[PDB]
């Protein structure tokens, strides 16, 4: 029971961590873009002074 217990534990979370990483990859396009425009937005604010 303990032996099987780990068998699905380790795999299931090896996944949940790993397929999360692909989300991180796509999360990066968001981060880059949101960073980019926010910096751009602040640049527009620099003109508003």
């Amino acid at each position: 029971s303990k032996d099987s217990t780990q068998a699905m534990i380790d795999t299931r979370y090896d996944t949940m961590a790993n397929q999360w990483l692909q989300y991180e990859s796509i999360l990066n396009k968001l981060n880059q873009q949101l960073n980019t425009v926010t910096n751009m937005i602040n640049a527009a604010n620099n003109s508003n002074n």
């Binding site: 989300y23 796509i26 873009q33 980019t36 425009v37 751009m40």
Partner: protein
């Protein structure tokens, strides 16, 4: 597969707000200069009656 189609579909339609804000300002501010240019045309008409 689902992850990638999402990306692909976005890439087809993607626009950057920075460029749009950037280009807008030039289009914006160039268009304003055109307004001043047009107002100059009014100032041309203003001068016909010296």
């Amino acid at each position: 597969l689902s992850v990638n189609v999402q990306s692909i579909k976005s890439n087809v339609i993607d626009v950057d707000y920075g460029e749009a804000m950037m280009n807008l300002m030039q289009v914006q501010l160039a268009y304003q200069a055109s307004l001043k240019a047009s107002t100059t045309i009014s100032q041309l008409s203003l001068l016909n009656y010296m």
